[PDB]
Amino acid sequence: HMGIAEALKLIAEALEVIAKALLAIALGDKELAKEALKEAEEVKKKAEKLKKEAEKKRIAAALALIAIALAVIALALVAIALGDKELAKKAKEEALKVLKEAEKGYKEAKKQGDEIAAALYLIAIALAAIALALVAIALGDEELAKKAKELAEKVKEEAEKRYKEAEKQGDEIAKALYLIAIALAAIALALVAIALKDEKLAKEALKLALEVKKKSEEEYEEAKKNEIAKALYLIAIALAAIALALVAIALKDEELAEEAKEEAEKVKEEAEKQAKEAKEQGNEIAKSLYKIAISLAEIALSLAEIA
């Protein structure tokens, strides 16, 4: 309850560091990169702290690890911004450590039958593939991009199958979290297409993002008649807009970049509206998630202007 809210706060903070690290890449602004770097290690330390507390007491532990994975992603971006091979190699170590913690926590969450914690660990696995995809870009590592690609395909196939089993359980939060995982899988694929200069894989990631976008939009109005599953469907839509912008970057397509930017503006409006409503009614976890959705729309806009 309280440990969940601390984790969501940190996840929001890390998303702000990622937005800053992204802008530093666009502008070549190294002061911005050093700044984000200090913020991302502050976040990772606080997140590494909350992960021990929640384990020594499960949903907040996976949320703490998500924050760690998001901090590691900001590290990989800063390494791209500064051209720092040492930092990239540090991000590689940090990401594999996340991948190990998220594979173990995912394994026992399926045995224990904890559907939300499993969906949350599966998300952290997808975050690890994203981080590895960025380390591949920084280092020029083809084999690491292939490792990332194979990771993202496993997440996709398993999130799709576990999503249909959450439809048969009436677990709408897990249904949203598995949609988010498929959206993160599309993000990892567009990054690997960028890293490999691969056009067929970007066309693949594009078909995947459009599938998630259509499904998350439908599930969002269905949930509108939860308030948490509602905000999670919005996050999924924001994450799909991020993948569209990435494919607009990888294919050098401007109509796709305009379409990605227009969806990001649409989600932002809806999230601001919903967050206003959740604030007045005291839906603190929902307000947190709508906050997270605005952050993701901001990241999508950054990429959309880079394209």
Task: List, in order, residues 6 or more apart from 97 with CB less than 8 Å away.
Answer: none
Contact call for residues 179 and 215 (beta carbons, < 8 A): yes
- The torsion angle over the Cα atoms of residues 9, 72, 172 and 187, rounded to 10 degrees, is 130
Q: Tell me what percent of the chain is helix, strand and coil, each rounded to the nearest 5.
A: 90, 0, 10
Q: Which residue in 21, 131, 119, 7 sits closest to 69, CA to CA?
A: 131
Cited resolution, angstroms: 2.8
Q: Are 68 and 59 in contact (CB under 8 A)?
A: no
Nearest to 122 by CA among 103, 145, 98: 103
Residue among 139, 78, 144, 66 nearest 106 (CA): 66
CA dist., res. 126 & res. 207, Å (int) = 18
Tell me, what DSSP letter sits at residue 168?
T
Residue type, 304: A
Picking from 144, 142, 245, the residue whose alpha carbon sits closest to that of residue 197 is: 142
Angle in degrees, 0-180, between the axes of helices 284-306 and 2-27, rounded to the nearest 10: 10
Q: What is the Cα–Cα distance from 175 to 189, expressed in whole angstroms?
A: 21
Judge whether 50 and 10 are in contact, CB under 8 Å: yes
State the method: X-ray
Give the span between the Cα atoms of 67 and 268, in whole angstroms.
Answer: 22
d(CA 14, CA 281): 26
Which has the closest alpha carbon to 125: 117, 137, 115?
117
Angle, CA 154 vertex, CA 148 and CA 158 arms, to 5°: 150
Can you tell me the distance from the alpha carbon of 200 to that of 196, in angstroms, rounded to the nearest whole number? 11
Q: Please check whether residue 155 is in contact with residue 185, taking contact to mean a CB–CB distance below 8 angstroms.
A: yes
